[PDB]
Amino acid sequence: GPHMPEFKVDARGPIEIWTIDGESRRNAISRAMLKELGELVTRVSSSRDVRAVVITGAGDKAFCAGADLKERATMAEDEVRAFLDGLRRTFRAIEKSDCVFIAAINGAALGGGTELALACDLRVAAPAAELGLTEVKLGIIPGGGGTQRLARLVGPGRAKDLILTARRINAAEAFSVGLANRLAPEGHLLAVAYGLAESVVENAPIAVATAKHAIDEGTGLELDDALALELRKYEEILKTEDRLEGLRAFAEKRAPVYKGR
Amino acid sequence: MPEFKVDARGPIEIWTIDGESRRNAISRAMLKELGELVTRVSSSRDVRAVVITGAGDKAFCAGADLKERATMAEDEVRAFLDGLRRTFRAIEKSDCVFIAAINGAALGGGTELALACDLRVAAPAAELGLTEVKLGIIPGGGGTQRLARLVGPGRAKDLILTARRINAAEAFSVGLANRLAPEGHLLAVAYGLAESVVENAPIAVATAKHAIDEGTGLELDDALALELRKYEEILKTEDRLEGLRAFAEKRAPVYKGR
Amino acid sequence: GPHMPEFKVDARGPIEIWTIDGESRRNAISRAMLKELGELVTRVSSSRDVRAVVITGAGDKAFCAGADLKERATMAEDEVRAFLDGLRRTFRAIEKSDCVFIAAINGAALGGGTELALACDLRVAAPAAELGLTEVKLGIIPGGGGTQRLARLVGPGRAKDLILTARRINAAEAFSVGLANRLAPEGHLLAVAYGLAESVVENAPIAVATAKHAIDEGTGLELDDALALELRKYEEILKTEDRLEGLRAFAEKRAPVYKGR
Ligand SMILES: CC(C)(COP(=O)(O)OP(=O)(O)OC[C@H]1O[C@@H](n2cnc3c(N)ncnc32)[C@H](O)[C@@H]1OP(=O)(O)O)[C@@H](O)C(=O)NCCC(=O)NCCS
Ligand SMILES: CC(C)(COP(=O)(O)OP(=O)(O)OC[C@H]1O[C@@H](n2cnc3c(N)ncnc32)[C@H](O)[C@@H]1OP(=O)(O)O)[C@@H](O)C(=O)NCCC(=O)NCCS
């Protein structure tokens, strides 16, 4: 009897699809769902097996309608803090993972739902996608990184527009301001997201992971410090065997085959 | 006469730079009065949004007053720049949300004033520009910092190093202007934008503004910790509970600012 | 042999045009090309005359393909490390120079060629312009600051798209995201880039250089620190004759005549 929506996980070798199966509450994130998401992120980040994950919502109405407001109604202040820590840890673990995370936005992504999308590396929007950080219309602020991650993508003026008005934008508006990387044709969201995952997986595993981390770890650094950080990562990747395979494959006019070492 | 006209409407006010004969320039007197206005609205949560515009249809603000500047010794220039910095930072630190309604040319310090505001609305024939290098100076009211943070460093270098004008279509396309207004409707649009913000919960709007700005230049973990500290400002509010009750009752919330 | 130089240098008073004269080799950064490039940057930085430089590649296929991998395979280990270090130093010198650098992107830019474009202050894209940082296809990451320079220009979402998927960005998208400041019509690349340079050099010489550095040095600073930096930079123009001339010209309703002092 308890309301216990959960994730479906579809494994496709180096790529997995995780679907929020919670349509009765528009794929809102409950306490137990967030615990499960964090656990799944930890486990994929301990494999080298899985190199890309697509996260999507079941159905055509909602990617994720935010935190579950029915459950939230009577949560005590410390319980709210614990939930926000779960968002923080989980979203940071997505960023720290060697795996690349793609949000396949199939419908409304509101509040925490947009925050989940912002934590991912890449975003694909279906025609029904709608994004918004609606928190101020609920009496709160974005507490899952939205006040920070949105401005990193769109700048403070557009971030203030969205966050202070709480208005919702459609897929193409999101694309045009740099919030969605791809616009999927109607009916083709998962095919587009999977193809995006394939385009990442064909590249060398450590190079993809290291480049991802170089980008995020440069956040907030002054240029000299950022360049020194990139150089440290570049020197590390020089020692991988895949780096040598890239040079050998080029010298031999053939495709490289990378092993993730 | 006062440097500004003030049209107070309770939680929203409209301030009009009343300086048409100098194209609404930032004289020392204008800057002092602007600071007094910002201080007043920042002293309580009763005024939640302010629209700033220029009188007339020629200029929002033509920048620092260059006739006054000709009379100023170097230490006076430094003092003016310090007061400009303080006033623009006071706009950012204020809980009140500031909307620049750009009714005409916004040049140099005038674009810097617009950039210090939270949101910008432009009339169809309005133009912006940081023209300082064409005057032998650089932006000294934050333009070299706020513009890049807004439109990216390449676009900022274009505008600042060429000193060119940017029109309304370009400004809207790149997000320098958040809204455009039909002719004769600039204030109606800017006031409507203010009303849209004021519909939302008072403490949450102010806290969210500050979370966005205070995250500038932070590394990610520090920025996320900052946001969680800011969330504490709304966690113990009655308005947070009203949001949840309104959702439960399938009705619109009505916030009280506590 | 006559020792054809790696660059053609067209001196036009306050502006120079540098054409990489390597069309048959995709305008690659060979050791010789890098050597000349670094010395050209030093020369224009010390030249009073030269205040802006347009860099372009010969032909319509390549702006600059990056390192010449055929040459690379012949280089000893110390020579490779010296090349990479010299490349990094040259990009930093472009950034620190008072001279304003405009990349006129006439074709494909890859690797170090894209990094060169990113080190410039402004970019103009011909219709054939295409830019990539596709290193993850080779088992490596950018080695000349490309990850950070790209992310600082276009943000982390767009940088992750380009670098993690190893896809190129073409002219219209480059313009939309602020990577290309101008789109040139077919056949008019250099006219557009030269006109952009002319529009910069109309302005006061010290002010232009100081403003360039104020913009660049502020990224990564918290706001109050960034504003303090701008006021320190203002000191560089406060005691100049050109500042007084701007005020006098305004008072006298005439055009200013700047002198770079
Ligand atoms: C996602 C959305 C656009 C879909 O609209 P819709 O298809 O017309 O669906 P409805 O609004 O009628 O909601 C359908 C069910 O989902 C529930 N639901 C929607 N969002 C929910 C959420 N965040 N938490 C818990 N339940 C939610 C509804 O209460 C309703 O269930 P009920 O009839 O048992 O009460 C709409 O539900 C919405 O805007 N939700 C956001 C709620 C919210 O404020 N999130 C905060 C982000 S800060
Ligand atoms: C705003 C502008 C586009 C309007 O053009 P316009 O309607 O044709 O008005 P004018 O240029 O003829 O100027 C009208 C009056 O305003 C004054 N004025 C304009 N800008 C001024 C300024 N920043 N400071 C002091 N006075 C100014 C003019 O000196 C003139 O005064 P006068 O009537 O006593 O001779 C034009 O004034 C302009 O470009 N100003 C920019 C000045 C500047 O360089 N500001 C600093 C940017 S770094």
Check if the beta carbon of residue B228 is closer than 8 Å to that of residue A84.
yes
Exposure letters B118-144 (e unless 16+ CB within 10 A, then b): bbbbbbeebbbbbbbbbbbbbbbbbbb
Q: What residue type is A84 in one-letter code?
A: L
A86 vs A89: CA distance, rounded Å: 5
Q: Are strands B49-54 and B97-102 parallel, antiparallel or unpaired?
A: parallel
Single out the residue of A260, A252, A250, A122 nearest to residue A203, CA to CA: A260
Nearest ligand to the C-alpha of residue A63?
1
* Sheet with C52-57, edge to edge strand ranges: C7-12, C15-20, C52-57, C100-105, C122-125, C182-183
* Residue A54 DSSP symbol: E
A221 vs A229: CA distance, rounded Å: 9
How many CA atoms lie less than 13 Å away from C189 in the CB half-sphere? 27
Reported as type and span, the H/E element at residue A15 is: strand A15-21
CA distances (Å), origin B184, targets B123, B124, B181? 8, 10, 8
Together in a domain, A129 and A107: yes
Single out the residue of C205, C133, C130, C137 nearest to residue C172, CA to CA: C130
C108 vs C88: CA distance, rounded Å: 21
Together in a domain, C156 and C260: no
Interchain proximity B136–C246, CB inside 8 Å: yes
C261 vs C258: CA distance, rounded Å: 8
Single out the residue of A138, A207, A169 nearest to residue B204, CA to CA: A138
A6 vs A64: CA distance, rounded Å: 12
Is B146 a known ligand-binding residue? no
CA distances (Å), origin C133, targets C140, C142, C160? 10, 7, 10
C21 vs C7: CA distance, rounded Å: 5
Q: Across the strands, what pairs with C125? A: C105, C183
Q: Which of B3, B22, B23 to mutate to test the pocket of ligand 2 (most atoms within 8 A of CB)?
A: B23
Owner of token pair 């709160």: A140
Together in a domain, A103 and A159: yes
Check if the beta carbon of residue C91 is closer than 8 Å to that of residue C71.
no
Together in a domain, B76 and B182: yes
C219 vs B218: CA distance, rounded Å: 11
Give the CATH number of the domain where residue B128 resides.
3.90.226.10
Interhelix angle B143-151/B153-162, nearest 10 degrees: 130
Strand, coil or helix: B16: strand
Q: How far apart are the first and last CA of chain C?
A: 45
Together in a domain, B237 and B135: no
What is the whole-number distance in angstroms between the Cα of residue B59 and the centre of ligand 2? Answer: 9
Q: Across the strands, what pairs with A169? A: A131
φ, ψ (nearest 5 deg) of residue C64: -170, 120
Radius of gyration of chain B (CA): 19
* Ligand 1 within 6 A of CB of A135: yes
C9 vs C7: CA distance, rounded Å: 6
Give the DSSP per-residue string, B67-98: HHHTT--HHHHHHHHHHHHHHHHHHHHSSSEE
Check if the beta carbon of residue A230 is closer than 8 Å to that of residue A218.
yes
Q: What residue type is A149 in one-letter code?
A: R
Q: What's the structural domain count of chain A?
A: 2
Is B206 a known ligand-binding residue? no
Reported as type and span, the H/E element at residue C123 is: strand C122-125
Q: Are strands B105-107 and B59-61 parallel, antiparallel or unpaired?
A: parallel
Neighbour tally for A39: CB within 10 Å = 12
Is B149 a known ligand-binding residue? no
Check if the beta carbon of residue B116 is closer than 8 Å to that of residue B68.
no
Tokens of C31: 């050791």
Together in a domain, A70 and A124: yes
Considering CB atoms only, which of C207, C230, C234 is closest to B133?
C207
Single out the residue of B141, B95, B138 nearest to residue B118, CA to CA: B95
- Asked which of B167, B198, B229 is the last residue of a domain, the reply is B198
Single out the residue of A45, A98, A46 nearest to residue A211, CA to CA: A98
What is the whole-number distance in angstroms between the Cα of residue B162 and the centre of ligand 2? Answer: 19
The alpha carbon dihedral of C15, B165, C155, C190 has a sign of negative
Check if the beta carbon of residue A44 is closer than 8 Å to that of residue A81.
no
A246 vs B201: CA distance, rounded Å: 55
Single out the residue of C232, C259, C227 nearest to residue C246, CA to CA: C259
Neighbour tally for A87: CB within 10 Å = 25
CA distances (Å), origin A236, targets A64, A206, B35, B125, C139? 38, 10, 53, 54, 12
Tokens of B33: 């009065």
Check if the beta carbon of residue B54 is closer than 8 Å to that of residue B128.
no
Query: Can B54 be counted among the known catalytic residues?
Result: no
Alpha helices in A8-138 (DSSP H): 31-44, 69-72, 77-96, 112-119
Check if the beta carbon of residue C75 is closer than 8 Å to that of residue C86.
no
Q: Are strands C7-12 and C100-105 parallel, antiparallel or unpaired?
A: unpaired
Chain A residue nearest residue B242, CA to CA = A139
B126 vs A218: CA distance, rounded Å: 37
* Residue B183 DSSP symbol: T
B87 vs A22: CA distance, rounded Å: 49
Q: Are strands C62-64 and A15-21 parallel, antiparallel or unpaired?
A: unpaired
How many residues in total does chain B contain? 258
A226 vs A204: CA distance, rounded Å: 23
C256 vs B136: CA distance, rounded Å: 9
Name, in order, each residue with C-beta under 8 angstroms of C258's C-beta and a sequence gap of 6 or more: B136, C203, C204, C205, C242, C245
Check if the beta carbon of residue B87 is closer than 8 Å to that of residue B41.
no
How many CA atoms lie less than 13 Å away from A129 in the CB half-sphere? 30
Query: Can B109 be counted among the known catalytic residues?
Result: yes
- Alpha carbon of C257: minimum distance to chain A alpha carbons (Å): 35
B87 vs C172: CA distance, rounded Å: 39
Single out the residue of B102, B100, B151 nearest to residue B122, CA to CA: B102
C94 vs C89: CA distance, rounded Å: 9
Together in a domain, B140 and B242: no
Owner of token pair 């969201």: A189
> Could you give the angle at the alpha carbon of C19 between the alpha carbons of C18 and C23, nearest 5°?
160
Give the DSSP per-residue string, C27-77: T-B-HHHHHHHHHHHHHHHH-SS--EEEEEESSSSEEE--B-HHHHTTS-H
Neighbour tally for A236: CB within 10 Å = 12
Neighbour tally for C127: CB within 10 Å = 18
Together in a domain, A49 and A162: yes
Check if the beta carbon of residue B15 is closer than 8 Å to that of residue B6.
yes
Q: Are strands C169-170 and B12-17 parallel, antiparallel or unpaired?
A: unpaired
Structural domain of B253: 199-258
φ, ψ (nearest 5 deg) of residue B183: -55, 140
Name, in order, each residue with C-beta under 8 angstroms of A210's C-beta and a sequence gap of 6 or more: A233, A236, A237, C141
Tokens of C233: 């930079």
CA distances (Å), origin A227, targets A211, A234, B67? 13, 10, 45
- Asked which of B173, B198, B223 is the last residue of a domain, the reply is B198
C206 vs C209: CA distance, rounded Å: 5
A133 vs A109: CA distance, rounded Å: 9
B142 vs C227: CA distance, rounded Å: 6
Chain A residue nearest residue C165, CA to CA = A200
Strand, coil or helix: C184: coil
- Asked which of C149, C174, C201 is the last residue of a domain, the reply is C201
Which residue has the least CA distance to atom 27 on ligand 1? A25
Q: How far apart are the first and last CA of chain A?
A: 47
Tokens of B258: 């506590």
Together in a domain, A185 and A214: no
Q: Across the strands, what pairs with B50? A: B13, B98
Interhelix angle C223-238/C241-251, nearest 10 degrees: 80
The alpha carbon dihedral of C65, A246, C173, B145 has a sign of negative
Together in a domain, C206 and C191: no
Tokens of B8: 């107070």
Tokens of B251: 């009705």
Together in a domain, A155 and A211: no
Alpha helices in C97-176 (DSSP H): 112-119, 146-154, 156-165, 171-176
Residue C86 buriedness (CB in 10 A; 0-12 / 13-18 / 19+): middle
Strand, coil or helix: B134: helix
* Listed resolution, Å: 1.1
Together in a domain, B171 and B131: yes
A234 vs C140: CA distance, rounded Å: 7
Tokens of C247: 């005020």
CA distances (Å), origin B106, targets A135, B76, B131, B167? 33, 24, 10, 11
Tokens of C51: 């205040």
Considering CB atoms only, which of B142, B162, B218 is closest to C222?
B218
The alpha carbon dihedral of A19, A21, A25, A29 has a sign of negative
Tokens of B162: 């060429």
φ, ψ (nearest 5 deg) of residue A230: -60, -40
Tokens of C161: 């798209």
Which of B133, B150, B157, B219 is the mutation pick for testing C, counting most C CBs within 10 A?
B133
φ, ψ (nearest 5 deg) of residue B119: -140, 155
Neighbour tally for B66: CB within 10 Å = 18
Q: Across the strands, what pairs with C109? A: C64, C131
B209 vs B91: CA distance, rounded Å: 11
